[PDB]
Write an enzyme that holds these catalytic residues in place. Sequence first.
Site, short mmCIF file in Angstrom:
data_model
loop_
_atom_site.label_atom_id
_atom_site.label_comp_id
_atom_site.label_asym_id
_atom_site.label_seq_id
_atom_site.Cartn_x
_atom_site.Cartn_y
_atom_site.Cartn_z
N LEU A 685 0.85 -1.21 0.00
CA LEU A 685 0.00 0.00 0.00
C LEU A 685 0.86 1.23 0.00
O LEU A 685 0.61 2.11 -0.81
CB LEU A 685 -0.99 0.04 1.18
CG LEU A 685 -1.82 1.33 1.36
CD1 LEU A 685 -2.78 1.58 0.18
CD2 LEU A 685 -2.55 1.31 2.70
N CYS A 760 -9.98 -8.02 9.87
CA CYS A 760 -11.26 -8.22 10.54
C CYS A 760 -11.40 -9.72 10.73
O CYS A 760 -11.51 -10.43 9.73
CB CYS A 760 -12.41 -7.65 9.70
SG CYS A 760 -12.29 -5.87 9.40
N1 LIG Z 1 -2.54 -6.26 16.16
C1 LIG Z 1 -1.72 -5.86 15.09
N2 LIG Z 1 -0.88 -4.79 15.16
C2 LIG Z 1 -0.08 -4.44 14.11
N3 LIG Z 1 -0.06 -5.16 12.96
C3 LIG Z 1 -0.85 -6.26 12.81
C4 LIG Z 1 -1.69 -6.64 13.89
N4 LIG Z 1 -2.34 -7.77 13.49
C5 LIG Z 1 -2.01 -8.07 12.29
N5 LIG Z 1 -1.07 -7.21 11.84
C6 LIG Z 1 -0.53 -7.25 10.51
O1 LIG Z 1 -1.69 -6.99 9.72
C7 LIG Z 1 -1.20 -6.98 8.40
C8 LIG Z 1 -2.41 -7.01 7.48
S1 LIG Z 1 -1.85 -7.12 5.77
C9 LIG Z 1 -1.69 -5.37 5.27
C10 LIG Z 1 -1.50 -5.19 3.76
C11 LIG Z 1 -0.53 -4.02 3.58
N6 LIG Z 1 -0.98 -2.67 3.99
C12 LIG Z 1 0.23 -4.08 2.27
O2 LIG Z 1 -0.13 -3.38 1.19
O3 LIG Z 1 1.21 -4.82 2.26
C13 LIG Z 1 -0.37 -8.25 8.34
O4 LIG Z 1 0.82 -8.04 7.54
C14 LIG Z 1 -0.17 -8.61 9.88
O5 LIG Z 1 1.11 -9.17 10.27
#
Ligand SMILES: Nc1ncnc2c1ncn2[C@@H]1O[C@H](CSCC[C@H](N)C(=O)O)[C@@H](O)[C@H]1O
Length: 1139
Positions: A685, A760
């Site tokens: 992103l 989610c």
């Molecule tokens: N409680 C939390 N705090 C911080 N990060 C978290 C979390 N739980 C999950 N994640 C992270 O949530 C992410 C969602 S994937 C995000 C996609 C990203 N923005 C891109 O374009 O690459 C995962 O990589 C996972 O390791």
Amino acid sequence: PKCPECGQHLDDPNLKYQQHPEDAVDEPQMLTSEKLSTYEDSPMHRFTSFSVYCSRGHLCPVDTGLIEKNVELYFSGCAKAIHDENPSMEGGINGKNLGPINQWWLSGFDGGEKVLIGFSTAFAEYILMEPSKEYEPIFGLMQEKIYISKIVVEFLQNNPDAVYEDLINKIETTVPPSTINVNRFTEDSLLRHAQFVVSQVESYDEAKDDDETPIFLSPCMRALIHLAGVSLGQRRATRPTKATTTKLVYQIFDTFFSEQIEKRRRCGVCEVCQQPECGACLKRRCPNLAVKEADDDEEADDEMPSPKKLHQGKKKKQNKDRISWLGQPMKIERTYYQKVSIDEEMLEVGDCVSVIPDDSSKPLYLARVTALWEDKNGQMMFHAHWFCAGTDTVLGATSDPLELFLVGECENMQLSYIHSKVKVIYKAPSENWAMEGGKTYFFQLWYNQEYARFESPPKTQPTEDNKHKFCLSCIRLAELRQKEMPKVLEQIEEVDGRVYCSSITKNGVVYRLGDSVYLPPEAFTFNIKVKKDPVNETLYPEHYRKYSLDAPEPYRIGRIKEIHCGKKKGKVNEADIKLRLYKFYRPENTHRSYNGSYHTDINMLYWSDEEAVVNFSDVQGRCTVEYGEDLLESIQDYSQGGPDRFYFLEAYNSKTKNFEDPPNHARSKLPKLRTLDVFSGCGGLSEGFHQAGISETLWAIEMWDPAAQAFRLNNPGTTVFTEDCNVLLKLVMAGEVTNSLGQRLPQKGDVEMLCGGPPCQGFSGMNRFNSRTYSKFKNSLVVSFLSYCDYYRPRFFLLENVRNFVSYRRSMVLKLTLRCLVRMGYQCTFGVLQAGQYGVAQTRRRAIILAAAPGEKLPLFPEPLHVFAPRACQLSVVVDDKKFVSNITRLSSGPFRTITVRDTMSDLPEIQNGASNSEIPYNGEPLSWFQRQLRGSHYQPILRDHICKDMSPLVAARMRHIPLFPGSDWRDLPNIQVRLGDGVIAHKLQYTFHDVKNGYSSTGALRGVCSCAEGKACDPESRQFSTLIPWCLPHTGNRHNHWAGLYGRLEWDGFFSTTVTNPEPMGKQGRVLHPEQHRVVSVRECARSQGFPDSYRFFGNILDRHRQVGNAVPPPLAKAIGLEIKLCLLSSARESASA
Ligand SMILES: Nc1ncnc2c1ncn2[C@@H]1O[C@H](CSCC[C@H](N)C(=O)O)[C@@H](O)[C@H]1O
Ligand SMILES: [Zn+2]
Ligand SMILES: [Zn+2]
Ligand SMILES: [Zn+2]
Ligand SMILES: [Zn+2]
């Protein structure tokens, strides 16, 4: 010959008879021994050298269900002291023919590595130890079964929401002890034991009970149930996360609970459906129903006509006392405008009124008195600019009963319709609004029904030529009608009743002579041009199952030669603007066709001397078609310079089918926001945003180590916090300067832009909210994310999610999110986008929530740049039975051809199943335009991550035998005995039952893989494992559309089904086998399917890399959005540059 008691075939070489010890006495006698004695009545005892056998002496398994089938099973071996841990036959009594087994059971699924196996008899409960030398094999299999079950239960207790591909990986990767004579477990084994494993897992939920979700209902569990036809209900064995929120964000989710929060399709035929009763307990609920419900909660409903405009609509007149004007008239127009009117009490212009409607849909109508006047018929008039109540906006119930919204709704009315004067306040943002993070009617934002856009009110301004008529709703409409208006700007000199012009306009675009134009495929034409045989069914028994819309053409391009039009009576008819264009060929439009559409640039054209006449209505937009030979910069530089930029170097002679040079008449800062990417992942992103030149990520929050690691490698200037955003937020909220690791924490005012993908998981369903579902969402990563927004107050906000986010929990998840932003005072909107329409060969829809601070502008959703299959393109959102759409007009067509798997990975060197070398040469040049861009103009020697999973000898074998012809899957596999390299041999599928719904093969052969094909209940042992055609696929085929394309190869002209995270052939992630190679897709291929440049680095093991990529937002989609924020910034920069 076969036993009347147990059923075993006497000719079975692996049969065994009961061999007895001496001192072996009958059960009641051996239970009266002094060598023998938790909170129960038994007595409990240990048991060694055990053997289980039928009434005739055949050694029998207990798992098989013979106890259940009423068959009396007798056991024998040494019984020991409850405390005696020695499995050596020494401290005990030998028993013989020990009571028929009432039932058997297990215990050991928590903080206990040991799994105890107990038998219950008419007299006592016994804990088994070691089997006899003769029984050892039989217990052997049973033991193996129990172990997979343990691994499955344990994992699920720790990871609910686990998907099928994870389960497989958990199993696959677990190292079994020596005590279990299996080298390692596979999907094949799980599938083989699928009934034991599932029935074991059901029992764990029936046993260890909480108000928590049954472990058998997890995605992987239901996936395994559907894949391997499993009978649910055959059970047997027994024995406070809180979101770091601000006051404001807490309040919203706390009130929704303390307001809107209030609280039977049983199967009949199942073993759980045939058992009473509860107030004895509180649980007797059907598992087959539990699944259908759990499955239906996962699916949404995507047509539906436009939502009705508010206040149209009936209002009722009131008073007949005294309405008289006050003061000297403001102006004159047939109309005589006034400033004050006295209906018993004083009522000025700009005051708010209430209007009593007809007693039906009963909300009280609210309006801003825009104008007061007297018409030619001496009737006292007023202009009522309507307000929208909080409940009437997308928000609904979530809104403040007192919050009102400005709408594009106004009408003239007689002063009789007025009820009373109402106090309506503008809750304007503070001077310092950014630092603010942690009665009567009020208003804050302007609401556009059509596009669910909450925006900052204009403000304004009332000119002295309209200080009396001042209606914003009237002004908006006026501006809109002006842009939507086709108008001539400059005309040359008229001809035969048609005027020839030099510049025209529409939608805000100025069209001059020579400017190029986009038109639908129907707008003009080019110089066009002009049975299956018998399959060997013995070889391909499953091919019968094989049996049993596509992307449009991009816009037609033309250059403006004439703007001739038509004339109405005296002056020019705008309804008749016509254009004479020089037709531009695309390589695909040439004799070349599909071969033109390969190695060529996505934006290359061919000039043509051909001509066409089209109405100025048919025009979609304007573009730039330039001759490259007369160019300032390189073709690449010009192409990468701005939107709608095409080029031509030659001209297509349509007649000769040749390439002449073109005729001579065919010849001629951005403030990067300081961003915080929460749930950053490997940074896909942020990548598209950096690609947009509109940002710079200074702080990224990643909980998972491999991802945060991968982020840093691509973003060296970023403070990557490897924490839970909840601790990270609490620290700033506590007043910290730095974290444990000594990294500068972002502080208020530091963050200009907030972006992230909050996962989610605890509530991600569709049904009505509940005490359980709400508590899960109340503390969700969505609420932690909105707290970040409230505290930090960035100029821009983005929440990217799974398209169903928009539909989750009867759309309540989206309604509360939007509510939050409105409470803070932010302009906001939602919208769905198909990544495929943005230059990626994948079909993935994402929910996108845009938010922008009062002062900045609300961005628009980007216009699709790629033509995509309509099916993949349903972007509409139905909320509370009202269809909400985005500003996206291109529904429909686009300017560029589709990106295909071919364009995505055609240039990659051959790799075999189980490729491990991270760094390899490309061994060739890029072939497609797409490839050229991700590989880059700058030479890269190393190919990275062209690593692919090592599949089992069986799966490997299966892939070799999947044909290369497009849209080929399992159904094409041959029923052949493949030598699995190693000692193991994948045998033929035995077809022993009749399929009553599928019939006979052409050879008169049977199609039935199990007794349930006949309509009877599945006979186990009819189950086959290690078969080339997976036995489970015919088993469930019929009830699951013939297992679509499981073991399917990607179509070179096709796409990726979705965001692949763990490529499994029988997985829920779509077709995963490579179009030509006998393998599954490599990490880089997936990385390419995401539109990641080949430089983009990834960290961890193969699977971490696989997860990193399939978790990412494809940079092409991110850039598309970023580019919309681009205009939003420049526009707001020129606007804040005046006097
Ligand atoms: N409680 C939390 N705090 C911080 N990060 C978290 C979390 N739980 C999950 N994640 C992270 O949530 C992410 C969602 S994937 C995000 C996609 C990203 N923005 C891109 O374009 O690459 C995962 O990589 C996972 O390791
Ligand atoms: Zn027998
Ligand atoms: Zn049932
Ligand atoms: Zn108006
Ligand atoms: Zn069956």
